[PDB]
Every structure is written in structure tokens, then in C-alpha cells.
Write a protein that binds this ligand. Structure first.
Ligand SMILES: O=C(O)c1cc[n+]([O-])c(O)c1
Ligand SMILES: O=C(O)c1cc[n+]([O-])c(O)c1
Ligand SMILES: O=C(O)c1cc[n+]([O-])c(O)c1
Ligand SMILES: [C-]#N
Ligand SMILES: [C-]#N
Ligand SMILES: [C-]#N
Ligand SMILES: [Fe+3]
Ligand SMILES: [Fe+3]
Ligand SMILES: [Fe+3]
Lengths: 233, 200, 233, 200, 233, 200
């Protein structure tokens, strides 16, 4: 089984968005009032699932085919997963989901008036390679109106989930597109206090990875908590 | 002082988490393989139990779009990290609350004991990560069992919670569901009886 | 009757002071803890009273004549009421109230040791003109000590109420005087996070509107929520 | 993006708001024409009602310096914007809580149904705006009637409130004062049973 | 007995750390949620004890001797106690406490693994002189790990308590050492919002007061609330 | 405006405050002379009483590391500032809560009446300053007595507290301890029944 060999760099809770971020209304009632209780890392926290053996479908990472061709901006979303030390995270599970080109989600609860795309599902998943590289093929999602303030609109975004080597590293976040005017306005984006942190969530146009006369590309690297060996414990 | 590369900032899972992580719930067609709420196959060693609970917000209202991830040792107190649908037991699972009742269920086995970095055994526990809209960074918790009072008393982790009354918040209540042994574990995100959340 | 023909630009709640501003002690217990519920504008919200037919007295806007001559600095407070589009707001109701020269209000609950002024009430009202212009004649109010911190003093100010075209635009605020040093020290003022917003509250000395050998004048323009026609609804 | 002129920022009405907007209450002489709490002349069409309530702070203490403004349609569900002391009915009114008892009252008629922008009817309601010391920016609310249960369940506005329990905070409880139809509407600014406040 | 002849400058509650400073976990549950009630100064508040006749031991202020010689950086911590007007506070009570060189406290509840120092107690007291000067002799305390975040460490620090002329002046604070890299990471330090206020807690290396071939010295001056005579009361 | 030197910023006393200010409690040898909890010697004029109480946090949990300083007038309503262990009565004292029970105790005399700056008499009271880990800046409060009801009604200070219900947080409840006149005074730092704290 797994073993307690690693220690993970402590999270920077001033970098990540805080719990209570009033402009994002839902956070009001969904944030603890009591302080998080700090505990030492043990086997429970320093291990996690390995998805190497999960049976991935041939088009798991291709939203263009995994659900007719979808209407919208053909793009490739690729990047690398590294830890804080710059060390690649091979064979890790990356999962993503988004709305269609008009900003509509293929979800029961979404009442937005933009129509669904008969050839679009919105879910993708893949395992990073030996160098920590991943890649997905999809369409650029559209902004989404939501009930926060009276005229709130989410920037075009793709939801991401990344496992990493332990439950200690597991992360859920969102990718935004370089230059989208809605970003600086988003209360959800704004939950993050450091403008520098904000910049980490913006996918950059990557002309070098685009397929001429076919699809454009965006680069999105993700960094997980640094993994070090225990010493003098 | 020294600085490493900064960790990618977290963001809420959003109300539609399900489309990506709980296909069924989203009400979408699933794939051949899906990570779900059945950690143990009927033929898995250990005491088969069912876990269930509700999630409450600060106003006492149910959180019906919550997404939970669990991590626990097997009956032998061993972490089975190689995730495989063929396995009789998987240490890792996923679940979500019903949009109706707002209750989550998990099918597993009572975990065996594991020791802390310092060689001290921790009471049987399930590690839980809670995600949902309105949650910017997922919340970490542990589920302990009320029938392990003895172990619980001595748990090095439980013992770090300064106020004894707050420890009680991490103890699942043994019950029976359809004549099957079950433990109920409600999470109170904010306010009165607010559940202890961990940082590690 | 009234008709739902207008939409009002959404309020910027990061421009206006927030509800919880603990330095202003009283806001503590008088601020909601739950988030505001955003609703779309309906005829209920987009209409409001028209005060054109209100029977104003002759000296309604003249605090010097409406209550002997009051003791204090004789001034004219004038300016224009426009919307965010810069459009004038004609025939709207503007009401003002204030303390006397010594910072004493003619109100039951005011126990400040500064005496009342026999010839002064402290209340005025008027309707903006075709051009959105308003004007009052009064005396410059004095600063007032209040029970906040142990040595809090309100800068000299004048309370203003403006109706605008609908309940959506109705606003209550305070005018402050250019250069008063108490301004940056006031917790009520500091309830406003943006220094730029603070600035909109300062009436500027207006020598061009002064009456030589008689009274000075202050200029205070007021900006209401922008009004636009509905489109593609 | 495009930026317009910024709206002038709000400030608290202050403790002496009465001097300016509730002359009598200040204990000062009124003027010839005052905007007050009598929306309907005894001979106005519709069902005449008396409205009253209290305003509480987060400590459960009465707020005795509160100032409220109302806006409602007539018995025919029409907004009479032309304000005139002559009219039998005015859609607009003002009121304030007593320095003693700390109760506010309003004399009007029960409003008719108005449709929303979409053409769907709203349950009968009174639009309220609350001002007071400690209130940096006025709070907006709606008063609904407990006897229009049917209407209420279908109101597009009421329906926007996520939690059903919160909707109840907007319902006035019918009664009778001096043999007259009365509706009590308490406002809890903060805490337990906090009244729903809106943004528009 | 004591008499009401003085008044004290009102505290700046934005200068001092506020009550609720969430990164300092303990503060959450120990901060009042209601606003402080301001009250006029009275004899009750403007008087306080005079320690002129307290019977001090010969080594009260010498931590090297008041408990073998302790192991650690031998230092002198001296300075002056003045009020906000720059006026010296003579014959006032100064009390200090601290951990040993390893950051271990001689307190029941201190479970830190660094050992105790047989020759070290960690308590000192002395009266300021006629000029408002005080001085202690001790060893430089070590940083200390504490259960706040998972890897928090208090900068090396000395706890101080100063009486002043009245209970209105009584203060408890902490001295930090010039150049300590931990200073800026401490949530306790950070409870103070103004970086300029932070600077006041930093004792400066004072070569001029050092005993060559013996012990270094640090300078730490303390400013108590300004005292003024009542006027036109 | 004019600016003076800024006062040295406060900092929490920390959990180990006892090593410095409550030697005994720290479980350390004391010095010849210590400032403690016995303000009056048996032979001091006035009514000898015993003060006792607990300190609670926002969760209703005992604060076992609190440190308190008291300042009171003598039986004649006179402030004795010349601190000396030889005195039969000292206006200044120190106390702390037991790590166990979490209770503090003080041995003194009921103070005589004192007038405010304006010549109005204040009800007999004890000035208290609270210190502890988690407390950035000490909290100031006052202990009034329940048997001084007539006096308490007229106290200009007590009358400054806007809400009458809050005033009661300041009144110690008389009883007997080992047949001695005692008053119990519990401080609730936060929440329900939160003790009034002052700024001067
Ligand atoms: O938190 C929410 O309410 C929310 C709504 C819509 N989208 O798209 C999100 O990502 C998040
Ligand atoms: O909110 C208050 O307490 C207050 C007091 C005095 N004035 O003049 C105000 O404008 C506001
Ligand atoms: O407030 C605390 O918890 C704390 C802990 C340790 N030290 O050394 C302090 O000074 C303060
Ligand atoms: C997005 N859910
Ligand atoms: C203004 N009161
Ligand atoms: C530190 N006490
Ligand atoms: Fe989304
Ligand atoms: Fe005012
Ligand atoms: Fe310390």
C-alpha cells in the first residue's frame, strides 16, 4: 500500500481565496466561523489515489468527439503539472468541465436561455504523461449570467480538478482566458486578494501549439504543493 | 527567506460540479468507468457499513449541491492507492448530495487503525474533502465512529482540538438503515455545532 | 399612471459604503448578515413619485427666512442633479436638513450644549428646474461631537435627500465643505472605501455664485443612477 | 469597458432625519403640505387597511429612530405617481417609528396586482425603503399579505428567494385594530429571522 | 490620595491591532462582537497605582542572576518611557518576561521540546528612573513554534508590561529584534495593520551601550498615552 | 491637524503571562514582594467581601489563561495609589483564572462612592482590565453590585449604555462563600450576554 515518505509544503491561505468573500454571496452562509484546526501530516494526508489503472475511453480528453461537431471556437488546452519545486507530476488525474459556446451547461439546474449544443457534452479527463503534460481538445465556452449582484457575468472559464500525489495536493480551480474583460469584474475571481495569484489562473494564447487552419491553443500550467522528503523527524 | 513557485489558487467547484465529477447526478450519460460511492465490493474483508449524511449551511438550510471525496484505509488499516474498479476495495471514493433530500451515501467498510508520523495509532477515521458553490477552497474533515469511544479518547489528531465539545462534531452516529449497520455524519458548515475543519 | 419604460444602471455597491463599517459603531447592529437578494427591475422599481404638484411655501428653500436673521455664515448651496449619462433630472425633489452655526440641531433628542438659534429651523426643500438646478440659502453648519469613539466630531455637513425619477434612484447622503480637516477623521465618511467617492461629497467654494458684500456660495452637483430605455427585452 | 459618471455615494440618514423628513416627530412645526403616512383618503376605492410594525437590530433591540418610505399601486394595481394632497389616493408615503413605543403606522389600501417585466403577475405588495442611523445605505424590502397565500406562492419575486423559510419574512400577519383590518410587519435587520433585503 | 487632575489623549484604535484578526486563530473566539462603549475619563480612569514603595530585590532586573550562568547571547535591554508629548515617565513599573535561548518557557503549559535552562527563570521588573530610563540584563530568547497555522513560529520576543501614571496608560506589548526574518510572517505581529506601528516594536542594536568583551545591548523606547491638564472643563 | 508621538502598539499578553505577572500560577518561585489578589488586610475598614467569577469565550468555553487587573476606591470612596504591602488596603490588585476550574478570586472591601468629572456620584464599582492570549488589546470593564440597586439606577456611567439589558452584564450577583459576603462576576467576551467593554 501507500507509505508515509513525503511531507507537503504548507498551504499559503493568504494566496488562496479566503473562505468569506462577501461579494460572492453564497460564500456568506457557506464559510466556517471557527478557525481551521492545524494538524501534522500523517499517512492519511500524505497519500492519495493513483489513477494509472483507470480505464479511460479513447475520447475522454476530446470534447470535440466524446459526446456531429460542436459549434464554437476550436481550441486545444494543454500545459504541465509541476509541484512548487518545479518537479513534474506524472500520471496524475486532470478532469475538466465547462459550458458550451453560448454559456449553457448540460446540467439539469441550468436555466440559462442559451441553447444546448446537440454535439457537446462538456466533460473531459486525462492522465498527465511522464513529463507531467496534459492536453484536452474542446471549444471555448461563453460567459455565463448568474444570480449574484443584479448584472453579474462569469468570465468564459473551464473548471479543473487535479489529484496530485496525495489528498493533500488535490485541487479544484478554474481557468480563464487571456484578456477577457469580465475577469477583473468577477466576484468569484476577486475572492483571490493577490492580483499576482489571479494571473496564475489565466490561460495564455499559444500560437506555437495551434493547428494551422484548424484550432487555436491555450497554455495552462498548474502547480501543486511542493513534495519534499521528511528529514530529522 | 526562500520562496518556491506559488501553488495554483483554488476556486469554488460551482453549482454544476456534477457534469464533470458526478455524471449520473448531473443527469448525464456516464462513461465505462466512473469514480463513485461504492468503495467496497460485497466480497471485501471488513465490517461492511453504509455512511450517510446531510450538509448544512450557516442558516441551517441544506446544501444540496455539495460534492464530497473520501479517503480511508482498508479493514486492515492499509491505504489502497492503486485505484481500480476490479479491486474488491478502493480507499478512494466520491459522492454528492441529492438535489431532493440533500443526503449523500457511501458504501464501504470500517477502516482499520493507522499510526501517526510519530508511531501513535489514530482512531479509525475517514478523511473527507467537501466541495460546493460558495466554497472557495475545499474543506478538510475526518469522520470518526461513536462505537470506537476508547480509541477516540486516545486519538492524537482528535486530541489537538482544544475544546472537547468540538471533538464531538467529528463523531458519526451508529444507526441501522434497512437493517444494515450505518453511521450518520452531518456536516455543519457554519454556526451552532459547526464541524471542525482541518488545515494540513 | 406610471409606466415601465426605463431601466436603471445597476448600483455599484463597492462605490457606496458597505453596511458593516465597525468604526461607525452603530452600523454593527444595524447591518444585515444575509446577502441582498438581487431582483430584476419591474414597474414597482422603475417608477416613483412626481412632486410637481406639491404645494411648496415661498421660503421653502430659504433657511434664513423660513423659521430675526440666524447668526452664522450666510451661504447659498446650489448645484445640478444629473444622471450617470450626464442627463439633467428636472422637477425632482431635494430636501436638506442641518444643525445651526454652533452644530446644534432643532430636535428633541439633541442634547449638545451649544444653544439653539431663535431664527433658525434647519430644514429646506425645493424642486430642481428644467435644467436640473437647485438652490438653497442657509448658514454654514458647525461640527458636532457624537458618541462614537471618545472624541468623535462630525465635520460640518448638510443632510440631503433626493427623489430622482423612481424609487430605484432615491438617495440620502451628506454634503461636506471643501477643506474641512475633520473630513478624513470621520468614521461615517470613512464608511466609504474609495477616496474618489469621498470627493463627490465635498461642496466646492463657488465665488462666481457668491453675492458680494452678502453671502458665499458652495456648489454641490448630485449624480443619480443612469436611466436608459429597455432594449431587446 | 465603458464607464459612466459614478453615482453620488449614500450616507446614513442620521438620528435627526425627522427634522427634515418627519417634522412632527422632530417636535417642530410642520409646513402647509407634508408627505406623511396617509396614502388613502377615507373615500378611496379598495380595501382600507392599517399597517404597523416594529424594527429590530441584531441584538433584538427596537430601532426607535427608523424612517421608512413606501410605494405601492392602488386597489386597481396602478401606480399613481402624480403626488397631490388632494388625491384620494397617493402611491407614495412616509412614516417613522416612535421614540417611545417604537412602532410605525401607515393608513392605506391593499394594492392590486402588477405584472413583472415578463408579463407575469406579482402577489399584491408594498415596496419599502428603510433609513436610519447606523444604516449607511437604505435597505429595500417588500411587504406581502398573509391572506394572499395563493398569489404569494406564484410571485416571480418571492420565488427568486432561494430558501422558502426566508420568504416568510416578507409576509404581513393580518389582524384587526379598532374593528379595522390591520397587518403587522416587523423588520429584523440582522440575525434570527432577518428580513430579506433586495438589490435592484 | 489620588486626584482627578489629568486627562489622557484618546487611544488610536486603528493604530493598535484590532480585536478580530482572523489569522491569529485565538482572536476569533476572544474578540467582542459589540462595539466598545466610550465613556468620559473620571478619577476612576485617570489614576492608578504608584509602585515607588514596592520592595524590589537586588537582581529583579537581572535575568542572568535572578534565578550558574544561563546559556545564550548575553544582552542588555534598556530604553526610555515617555508619553506622547515626549515627557518622561519616571518611577513607573516595567515588567518583562520571556523564553530561554532555545525558545523554551519556564511555564507548566510549555510542552516545547527545547530544554529548560537550569540557570534561567525569565522574569524581570524594575522602576523607571527620574529620567524615565529602565534597563534589564538577560539572554536573547529563541523563536518558538506554536499551534496556529501548521508551521508558525513567533519571532524571538520579550513580553513587556508598563503601568504609566494611570490605568488609562497601562499597556502590555512585545519587543522584537532588529532584522528578525520571522517578524513579517507572524500573525500576532500582523494583527497590527500599520507597518509603521510594527516598527515601534523593533528594538535596535545599540553598540554604544554594549559592554565590550561582555554583552551586547538593544534599545527599546516606550511611548504611553499623552497626559495633559484638564482645561475649561 | 497636530500629531503627537504615536503610542506603542499593544500586543496580546500570550498564554504564559503568568511567568511574568502571576508567578505562583506559573508554578514558579515568587519574589519577596508580589502584587496579588488581596487588596485588603483583615484590619481594613469597610465591608470585607470576596469577588469571584469565570471568563467565557464566544463559544461559551472557559478562558483558563485570562489575567485581570483591578482598580477600586477604599471604603471612603478614596483611591489609594501609594502601593505598599504594608498598607491595610491597596486600591490595586491582580488575579488570574485557575487552569482547572477557570475561576479567579479577589479579597477586598466594597468601595465607597466617587463622583464623575461633573460632580455626579457613580455607583460603587471596581475597574477591571482583562488580558489573555487571543486578546490583542486588553478589555476594560466595570463590576457593579446588585445590592446597590438604588445607586446603580442613577450612575452616569451605567446610564451611558444605550440598552438597558446590557447594563445588567455589569452587575455582580451577591451570595455567601463559607458564610462570607461574596459577589460573582462572570465576563462573557463574545456572543449571548456579551459583557459591556469600555473605551476611555
Ligand atoms: O458559484 C456560483 O454560483 C457559480 C455560478 C456559475 N458558474 O459558472 C460558476 O462557475 C460558479
Ligand atoms: O449616525 C450618527 O450617530 C450621527 C450622529 C450625528 N450626526 O450629525 C449624524 O449625521 C449621524
Ligand atoms: O497568543 C498566543 O497563542 C502566543 C503563543 C506563544 N507566544 O510566545 C506568544 O507570545 C503568544
Ligand atoms: C459552474 N458550475
Ligand atoms: C444628523 N443626525
Ligand atoms: C507567550 N506567552
Ligand atoms: Fe461554471
Ligand atoms: Fe447630522
Ligand atoms: Fe511568548
Amino acid at each position: 500500500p501507500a507509505q508515509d515518505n513525503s511531507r507537503f509544503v504548507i498551504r499559503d491561505r493568504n494566496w488562496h481565496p479566503k473562505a468569506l468573500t462577501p461579494d460572492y454571496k453564497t460564500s456568506i452562509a457557506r464559510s466556517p466561523r471557527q478557525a481551521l484546526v492545524s494538524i501534522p501530516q500523517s499517512i492519511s494526508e500524505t497519500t492519495g489515489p493513483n489513477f494509472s489503472h483507470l480505464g479511460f475511453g479513447a475520447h475522454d480528453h476530446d470534447l470535440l468527439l466524446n459526446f456531429g461537431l460542436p459549434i464554437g471556437e476550436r481550441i486545444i488546452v494543454a500545459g504541465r503539472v509541476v509541484d512548487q519545486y518545479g518537479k513534474p507530476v506524472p500520471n496524475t488525474l486532470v478532469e475538466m468541465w465547462q459550458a458550451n459556446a453560448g454559456g449553457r451547461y448540460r446540467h439539469k439546474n441550468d436555466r440559462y436561455l442559451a441553447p444546448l449544443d446537440p454535439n457537446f457534452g462538456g466533460v473531459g479527463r486525462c492522465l498527465t504523461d511522464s513529463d507531467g503534460y496534459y492536453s484536452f481538445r474542446t471549444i471555448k465556452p461563453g460567459p455565463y449570467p448568474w444570480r449574484n449582484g443584479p448584472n453579474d457575468w462569469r468570465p468564459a472559464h473551464i473548471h479543473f480538478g487535479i489529484s496530485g500525489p496525495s489528498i493533500a495536493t488535490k485541487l479544484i480551480t478554474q481557468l480563464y482566458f487571456e484578456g477577457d474583460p469580465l475577469i477583473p469584474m468577477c466576484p468569484i475571481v476577486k475572492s483571490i486578494a493577490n492580483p499576482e495569484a489571479v494571473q496564475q489562473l489565466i490561460a495564455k494564447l499559444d500560437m506555437n501549439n495551434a493547428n494551422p487552419m484548424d484550432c487555436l491553443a491555450y497554455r495552462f500550467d498548474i502547480v501543486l504543493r511542493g513534495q519534499r522528503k521528511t528529514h530529522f523527524e | 527567506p526562500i520562496e518556491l513557485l506559488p501553488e495554483t489558487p483554488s476556486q469554488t467547484a460551482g453549482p454544476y460540479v456534477h457534469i464533470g465529477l458526478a455524471l449520473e447526478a448531473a443527469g448525464n450519460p456516464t462513461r465505462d468507468q466512473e469514480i463513485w460511492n461504492r468503495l467496497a465490493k460485497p466480497d471485501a474483508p471488513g465490517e461492511h457499513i453504509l455512511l450517510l449524511g446531510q450538509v448544512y449551511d450557516g442558516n441551517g438550510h441544506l446544501v444540496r449541491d455539495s460534492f464530497l471525496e473520501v479517503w480511508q484505509a482498508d479493514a486492515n488499516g492499509e491505504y489502497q492507492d492503486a485505484y481500480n474498479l476490479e479491486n474488491a476495495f478502493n480507499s478512494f471514493g466520491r459522492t454528492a448530495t441529492t438535489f431532493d433530500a440533500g443526503e449523500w451515501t457511501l458504501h464501504t467498510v470500517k477502516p482499520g487503525v493507522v499510526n501517526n508520523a510519530a508511531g501513535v495509532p489514530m482512531a479509525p477515521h475517514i478523511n473527507i474533502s467537501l466541495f460546493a458553490r460558495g466554497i472557495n477552497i475545499h474543506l478538510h474533515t475526518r469522520l470518526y465512529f461513536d462505537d470506537e469511544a476508547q480509541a477516540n479518547a486516545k486519538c492524537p489528531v482528535l486530541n489537538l482540538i482544544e475544546q472537547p465539545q468540538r471533538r464531538e462534531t467529528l463523531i458519526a452516529k451508529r444507526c441501522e438503515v434497512d437493517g444494515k449497520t450505518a453511521y450518520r455524519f452531518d456536516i455543519r458548515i457554519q454556526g451552532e455545532g459547526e464541524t471542525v475543519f482541518f488545515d494540513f
